[PDB]
CSV table of C-alpha atoms in Angstrom, one decimal:
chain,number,residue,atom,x,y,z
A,1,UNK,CA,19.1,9.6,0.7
A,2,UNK,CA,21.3,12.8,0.2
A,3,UNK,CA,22.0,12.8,-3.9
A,4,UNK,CA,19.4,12.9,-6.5
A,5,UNK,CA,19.2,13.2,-10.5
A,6,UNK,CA,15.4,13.5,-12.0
A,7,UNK,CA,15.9,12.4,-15.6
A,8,UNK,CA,12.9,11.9,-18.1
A,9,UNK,CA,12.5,7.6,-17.9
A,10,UNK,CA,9.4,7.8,-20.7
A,11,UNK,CA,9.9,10.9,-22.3
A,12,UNK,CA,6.6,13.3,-22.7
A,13,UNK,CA,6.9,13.5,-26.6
A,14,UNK,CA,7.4,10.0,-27.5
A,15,UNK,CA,6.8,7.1,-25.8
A,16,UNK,CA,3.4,7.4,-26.5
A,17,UNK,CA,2.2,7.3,-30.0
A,18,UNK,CA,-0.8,5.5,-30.4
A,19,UNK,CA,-1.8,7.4,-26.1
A,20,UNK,CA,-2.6,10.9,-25.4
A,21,UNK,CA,-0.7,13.1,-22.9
A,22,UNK,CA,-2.2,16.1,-22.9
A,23,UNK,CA,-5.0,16.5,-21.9
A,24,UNK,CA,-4.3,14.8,-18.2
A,25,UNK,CA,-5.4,17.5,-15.9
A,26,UNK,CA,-7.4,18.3,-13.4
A,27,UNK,CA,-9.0,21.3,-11.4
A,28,UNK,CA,-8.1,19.2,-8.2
A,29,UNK,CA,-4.4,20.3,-8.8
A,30,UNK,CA,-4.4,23.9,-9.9
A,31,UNK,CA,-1.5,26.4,-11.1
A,32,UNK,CA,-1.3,29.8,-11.5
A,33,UNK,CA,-5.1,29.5,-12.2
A,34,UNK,CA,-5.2,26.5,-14.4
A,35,UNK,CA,-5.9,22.8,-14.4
A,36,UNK,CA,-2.5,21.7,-13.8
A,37,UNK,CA,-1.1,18.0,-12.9
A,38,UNK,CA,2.1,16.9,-10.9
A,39,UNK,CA,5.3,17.4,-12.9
A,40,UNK,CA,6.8,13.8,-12.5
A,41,UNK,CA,3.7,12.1,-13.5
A,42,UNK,CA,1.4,12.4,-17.3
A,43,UNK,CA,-2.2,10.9,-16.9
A,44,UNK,CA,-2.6,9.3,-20.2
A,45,UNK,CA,-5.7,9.2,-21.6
A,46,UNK,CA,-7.4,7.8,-24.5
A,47,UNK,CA,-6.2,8.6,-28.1
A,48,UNK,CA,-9.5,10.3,-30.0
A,49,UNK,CA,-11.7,7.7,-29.3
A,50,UNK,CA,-9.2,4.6,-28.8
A,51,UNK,CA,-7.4,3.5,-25.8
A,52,UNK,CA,-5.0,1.0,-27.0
A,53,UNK,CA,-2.9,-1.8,-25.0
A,54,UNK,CA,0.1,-0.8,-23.4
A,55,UNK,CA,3.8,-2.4,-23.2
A,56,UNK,CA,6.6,0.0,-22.2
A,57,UNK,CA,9.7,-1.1,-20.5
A,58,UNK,CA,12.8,0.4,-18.6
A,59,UNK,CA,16.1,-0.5,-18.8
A,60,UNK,CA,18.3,0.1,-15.5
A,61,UNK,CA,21.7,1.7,-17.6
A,62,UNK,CA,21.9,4.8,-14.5
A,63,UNK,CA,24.2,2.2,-12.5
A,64,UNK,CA,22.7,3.0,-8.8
A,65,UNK,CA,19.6,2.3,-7.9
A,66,UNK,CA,16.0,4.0,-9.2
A,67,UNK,CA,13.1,5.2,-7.5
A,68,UNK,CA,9.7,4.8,-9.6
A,69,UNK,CA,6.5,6.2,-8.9
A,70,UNK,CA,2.7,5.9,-10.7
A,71,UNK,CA,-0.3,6.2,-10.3
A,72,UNK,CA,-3.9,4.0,-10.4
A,73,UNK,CA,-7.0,6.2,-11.5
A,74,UNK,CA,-10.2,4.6,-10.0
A,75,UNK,CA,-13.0,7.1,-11.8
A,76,UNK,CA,-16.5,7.6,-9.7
A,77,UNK,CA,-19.2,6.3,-12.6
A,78,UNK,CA,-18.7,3.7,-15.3
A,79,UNK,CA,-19.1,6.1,-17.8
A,80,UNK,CA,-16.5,8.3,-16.4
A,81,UNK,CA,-14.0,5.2,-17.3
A,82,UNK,CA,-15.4,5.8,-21.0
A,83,UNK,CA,-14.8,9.0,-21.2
A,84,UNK,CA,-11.4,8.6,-20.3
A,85,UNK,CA,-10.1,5.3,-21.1
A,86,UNK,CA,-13.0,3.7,-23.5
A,87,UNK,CA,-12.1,0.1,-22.6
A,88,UNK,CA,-14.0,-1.4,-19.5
A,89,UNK,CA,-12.7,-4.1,-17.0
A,90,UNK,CA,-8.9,-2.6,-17.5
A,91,UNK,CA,-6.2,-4.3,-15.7
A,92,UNK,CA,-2.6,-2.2,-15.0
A,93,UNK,CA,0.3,-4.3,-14.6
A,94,UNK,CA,4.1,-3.3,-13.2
A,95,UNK,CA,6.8,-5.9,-12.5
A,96,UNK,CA,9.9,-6.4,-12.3
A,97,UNK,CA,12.5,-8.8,-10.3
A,98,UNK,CA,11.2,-6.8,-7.4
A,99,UNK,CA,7.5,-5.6,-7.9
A,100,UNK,CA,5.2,-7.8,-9.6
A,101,UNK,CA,1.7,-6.2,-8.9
A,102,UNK,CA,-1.8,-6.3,-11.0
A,103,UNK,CA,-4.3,-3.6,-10.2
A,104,UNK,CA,-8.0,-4.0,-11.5
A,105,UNK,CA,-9.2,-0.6,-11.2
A,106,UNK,CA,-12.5,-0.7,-9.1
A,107,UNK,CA,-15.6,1.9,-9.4
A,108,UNK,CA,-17.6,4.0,-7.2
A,109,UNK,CA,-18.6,7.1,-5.6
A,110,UNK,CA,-16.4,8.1,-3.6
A,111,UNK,CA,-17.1,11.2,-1.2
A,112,UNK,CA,-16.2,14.4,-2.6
A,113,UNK,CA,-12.6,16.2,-1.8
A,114,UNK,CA,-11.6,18.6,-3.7
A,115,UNK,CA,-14.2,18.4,-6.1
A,116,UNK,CA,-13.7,15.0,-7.0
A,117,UNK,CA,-15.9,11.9,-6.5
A,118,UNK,CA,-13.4,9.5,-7.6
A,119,UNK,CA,-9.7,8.8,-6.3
A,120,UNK,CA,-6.1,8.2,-7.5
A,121,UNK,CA,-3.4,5.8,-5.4
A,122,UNK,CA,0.4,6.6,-5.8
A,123,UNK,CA,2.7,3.8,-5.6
A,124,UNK,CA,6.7,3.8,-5.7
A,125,UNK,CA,9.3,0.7,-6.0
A,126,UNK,CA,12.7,0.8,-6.4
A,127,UNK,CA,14.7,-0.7,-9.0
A,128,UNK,CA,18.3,-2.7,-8.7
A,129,UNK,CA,20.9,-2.4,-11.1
A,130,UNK,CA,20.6,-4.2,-14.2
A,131,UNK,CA,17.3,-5.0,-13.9
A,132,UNK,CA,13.5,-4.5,-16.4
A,133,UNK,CA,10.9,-2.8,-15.1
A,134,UNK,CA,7.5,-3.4,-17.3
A,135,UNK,CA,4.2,-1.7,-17.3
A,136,UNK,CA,1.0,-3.4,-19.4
A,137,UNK,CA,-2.4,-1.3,-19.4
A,138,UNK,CA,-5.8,-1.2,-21.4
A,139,UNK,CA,-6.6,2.0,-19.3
A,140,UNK,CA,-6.2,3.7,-15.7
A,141,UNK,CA,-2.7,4.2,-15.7
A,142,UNK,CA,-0.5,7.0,-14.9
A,143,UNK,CA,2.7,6.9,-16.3
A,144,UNK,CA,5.8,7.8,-14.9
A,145,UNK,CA,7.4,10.6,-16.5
A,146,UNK,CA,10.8,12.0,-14.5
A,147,UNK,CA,12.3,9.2,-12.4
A,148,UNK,CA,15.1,9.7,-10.1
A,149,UNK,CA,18.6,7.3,-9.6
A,150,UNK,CA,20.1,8.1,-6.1
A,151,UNK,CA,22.8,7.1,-3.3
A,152,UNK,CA,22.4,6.8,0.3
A,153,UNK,CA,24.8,8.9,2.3
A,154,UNK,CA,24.1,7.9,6.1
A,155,UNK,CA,23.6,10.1,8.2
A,156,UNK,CA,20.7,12.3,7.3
A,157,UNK,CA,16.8,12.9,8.4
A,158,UNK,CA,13.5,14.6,8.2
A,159,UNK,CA,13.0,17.2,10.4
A,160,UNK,CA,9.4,19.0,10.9
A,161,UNK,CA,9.7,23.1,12.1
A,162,UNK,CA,9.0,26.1,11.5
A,163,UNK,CA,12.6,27.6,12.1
A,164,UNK,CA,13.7,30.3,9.6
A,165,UNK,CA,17.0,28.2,7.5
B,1,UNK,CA,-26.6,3.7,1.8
B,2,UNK,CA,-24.7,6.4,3.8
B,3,UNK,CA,-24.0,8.4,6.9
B,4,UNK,CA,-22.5,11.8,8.2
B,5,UNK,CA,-20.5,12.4,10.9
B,6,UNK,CA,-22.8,14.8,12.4
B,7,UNK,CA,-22.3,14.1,16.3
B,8,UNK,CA,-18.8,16.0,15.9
B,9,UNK,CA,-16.7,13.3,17.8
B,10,UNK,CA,-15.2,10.5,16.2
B,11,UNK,CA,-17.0,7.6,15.2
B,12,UNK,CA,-16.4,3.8,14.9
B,13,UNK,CA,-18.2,1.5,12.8
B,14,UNK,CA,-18.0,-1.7,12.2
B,15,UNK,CA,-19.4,-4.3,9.4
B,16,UNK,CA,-19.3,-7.8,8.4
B,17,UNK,CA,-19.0,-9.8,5.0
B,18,UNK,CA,-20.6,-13.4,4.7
B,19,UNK,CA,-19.0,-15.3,2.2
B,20,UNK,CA,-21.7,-18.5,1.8
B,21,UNK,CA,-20.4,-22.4,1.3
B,22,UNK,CA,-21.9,-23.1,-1.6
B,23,UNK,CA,-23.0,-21.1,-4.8
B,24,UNK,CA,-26.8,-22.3,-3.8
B,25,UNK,CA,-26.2,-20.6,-0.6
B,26,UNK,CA,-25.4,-17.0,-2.4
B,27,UNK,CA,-28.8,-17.3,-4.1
B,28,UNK,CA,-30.5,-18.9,-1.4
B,29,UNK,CA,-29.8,-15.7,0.9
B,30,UNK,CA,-29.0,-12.8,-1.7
B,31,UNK,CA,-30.1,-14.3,-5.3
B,32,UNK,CA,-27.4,-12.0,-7.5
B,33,UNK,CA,-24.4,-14.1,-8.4
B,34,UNK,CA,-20.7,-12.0,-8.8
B,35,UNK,CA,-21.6,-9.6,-6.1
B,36,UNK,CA,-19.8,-6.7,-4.6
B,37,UNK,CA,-19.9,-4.6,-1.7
B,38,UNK,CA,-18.3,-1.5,-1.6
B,39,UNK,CA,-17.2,1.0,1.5
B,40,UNK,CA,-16.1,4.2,1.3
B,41,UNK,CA,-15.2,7.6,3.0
B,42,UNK,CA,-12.2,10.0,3.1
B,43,UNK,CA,-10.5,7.6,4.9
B,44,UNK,CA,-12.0,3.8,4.0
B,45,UNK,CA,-12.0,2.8,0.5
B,46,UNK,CA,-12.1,-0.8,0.1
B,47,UNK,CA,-14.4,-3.4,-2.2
B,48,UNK,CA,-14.8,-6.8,-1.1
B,49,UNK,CA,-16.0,-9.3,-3.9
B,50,UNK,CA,-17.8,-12.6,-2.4
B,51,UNK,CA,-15.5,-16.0,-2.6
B,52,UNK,CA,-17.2,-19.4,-2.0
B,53,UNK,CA,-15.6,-22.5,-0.8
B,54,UNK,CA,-16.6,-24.8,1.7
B,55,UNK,CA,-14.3,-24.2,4.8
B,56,UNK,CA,-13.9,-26.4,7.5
B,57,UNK,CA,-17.3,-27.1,10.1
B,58,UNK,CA,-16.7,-24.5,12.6
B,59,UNK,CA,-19.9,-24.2,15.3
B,60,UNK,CA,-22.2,-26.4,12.5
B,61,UNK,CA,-21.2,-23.5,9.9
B,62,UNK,CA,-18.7,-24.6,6.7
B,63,UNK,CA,-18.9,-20.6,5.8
B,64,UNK,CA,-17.2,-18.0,7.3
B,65,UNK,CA,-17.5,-14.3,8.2
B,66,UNK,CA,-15.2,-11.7,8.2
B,67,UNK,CA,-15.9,-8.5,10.4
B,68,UNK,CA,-14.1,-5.2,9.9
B,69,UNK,CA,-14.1,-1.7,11.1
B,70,UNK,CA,-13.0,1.9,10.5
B,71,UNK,CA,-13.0,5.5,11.8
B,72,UNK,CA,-15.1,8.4,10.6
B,73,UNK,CA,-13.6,11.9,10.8
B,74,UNK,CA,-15.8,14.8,11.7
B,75,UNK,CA,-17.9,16.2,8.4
B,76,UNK,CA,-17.3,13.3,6.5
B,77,UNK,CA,-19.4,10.5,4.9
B,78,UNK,CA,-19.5,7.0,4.3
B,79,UNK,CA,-20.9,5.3,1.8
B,80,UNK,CA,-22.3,1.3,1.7
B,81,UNK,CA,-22.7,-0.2,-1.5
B,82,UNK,CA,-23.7,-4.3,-2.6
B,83,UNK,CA,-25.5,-6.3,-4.3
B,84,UNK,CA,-25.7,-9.1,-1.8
B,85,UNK,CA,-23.1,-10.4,1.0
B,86,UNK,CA,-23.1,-7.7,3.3
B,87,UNK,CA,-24.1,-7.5,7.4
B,88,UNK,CA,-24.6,-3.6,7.3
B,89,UNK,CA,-24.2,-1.7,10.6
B,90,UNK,CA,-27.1,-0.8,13.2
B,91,UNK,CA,-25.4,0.4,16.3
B,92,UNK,CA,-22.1,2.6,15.8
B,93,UNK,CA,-20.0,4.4,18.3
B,94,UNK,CA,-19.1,8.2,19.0
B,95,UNK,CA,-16.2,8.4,21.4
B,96,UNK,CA,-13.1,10.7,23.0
B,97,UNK,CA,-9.9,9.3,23.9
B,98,UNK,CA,-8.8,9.5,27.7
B,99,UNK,CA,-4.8,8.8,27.9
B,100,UNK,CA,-4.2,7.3,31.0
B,101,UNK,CA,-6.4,3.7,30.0
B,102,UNK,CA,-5.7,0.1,29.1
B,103,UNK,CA,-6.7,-3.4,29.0
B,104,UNK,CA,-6.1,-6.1,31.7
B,105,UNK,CA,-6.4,-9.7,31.4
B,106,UNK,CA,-7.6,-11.3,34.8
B,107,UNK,CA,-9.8,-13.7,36.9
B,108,UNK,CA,-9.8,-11.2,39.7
B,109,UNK,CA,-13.2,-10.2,41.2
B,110,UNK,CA,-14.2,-6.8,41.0
């Protein structure tokens, strides 16, 4: 990959109603001395005391390809999934003509890094032209908030160093 | 249940999940029905739920069981966690890598 363009896919401000974006943060991530989050990514969390179903969907009109990412939240306790996401036994959901994938979010105490008991997976997929990407959740779901379309160039590579650019 | 990694090499451990032939058999040996067991560490994080069936008679035994290992960096613990279904560890392994080592397969004495 050589070109890149981040554009919002489920914008911040809407898209969400009846869900919270706010207040997903986390000491694990800080920023400039606060409990800051990763700026493609909202950890959505429950709505006063509510955590709604979800059914949001992505159209493909960027005409090259997309790259998606998320995230699955699996909290340490079973009340930490109340406190977050009220509903218990969630299920996520994200398919497509390429991805079709259910994740039941699973519970334990996990060992402690970075002060935090519990753990959070990031996937990614990529999605063809023309094509509906849908996500379904009654809780542990983080969103995608800035996707990114792209085209491949060729030749190009990672390099690890130290060398001054 | 868990360990730490205090013998400051690597270690290996290894487990085992029995999933029974019957639903009889999962009370007969553990009693809880819909268990789980759970590992976990900085590196391992995997929960295994119990499936019954009765699989083909292999050495007079229709159930099966799956045996599985992992790594454990230095300082870091892992945790065991079921309600039934699990063949826990006893004797693990702390070890250092050589380089220059490999496996042969032959009938030649020693």
């Amino acid at each position: 990959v050589s070109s890149f363009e981040r554009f919002e896919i489920f914008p911040k401000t809407s898209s969400w109603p009846n869900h919270d974006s706010n207040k997903g943060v986390t000491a694990a991530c800080p920023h400039a001395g606060a409990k800051s989050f990763y700026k493609n990514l909202i950890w959505l969390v429950k709505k006063g005391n509510s955590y709604p179903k979800l059914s949001k969907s992505y159209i493909n009109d960027k005409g090259k390809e997309v790259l998606v990412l998320w995230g699955i939240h699996h909290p340490s306790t079973s009340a930490d999934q109340q406190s977050l996401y009220q509903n218990a036994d969630t299920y996520v959901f994200v398919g497509s003509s390429r991805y079709s994938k259910k994740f039941k979010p699973e519970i334990a105490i996990r060992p402690k890094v970075r002060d935090q008991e519990g753990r959070m997976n990031y996937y990614w997929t990529l999605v063809e032209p023309g094509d509906k990407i849908t996500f379904e959740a009654t809780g542990n779901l983080v969103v995608p908030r800035y996707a990114f379309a792209m085209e491949r160039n060729a030749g190009s590579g990672i390099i690890i160093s130290d060398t001054p650019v």
